[PDB]
């Protein structure tokens, strides 16, 4: 099941999130301010998969 980025960040924290998705943290205070749909994907090995619905589409988050 997927977390929001928001619920994922109120679950482990701010830094634990940049860490899991390699951005710097006032990026991703910012990504949720703007309310971007941000869904996260924890795997068993801890890694963790982000993709971004934008305009009707399914991207990898963060894009570039």
Do not use: C, W
């Not at 929001?4 to 860490?19: E, H, I, N, S, V």
């Not at 924890?42 to 890694?47: E, H, K, Q, R, V």
Request: overall charge positive; cysteine-free; glycine content about 8%.
């Amino acid at each position: 099941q997927r977390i929001t980025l928001k619920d994922y960040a109120m679950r482990f924290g701010q830094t634990k999130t940049a860490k899991d998705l390699g951005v710097y943290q006032s990026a991703i205070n910012k990504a949720i301010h703007a309310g971007r749909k941000i869904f996260l994907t924890i795997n068993a090995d801890g890694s963790v998969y982000a993709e971004e619905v934008k305009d009707g589409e399914v991207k990898p988050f963060p894009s570039n």
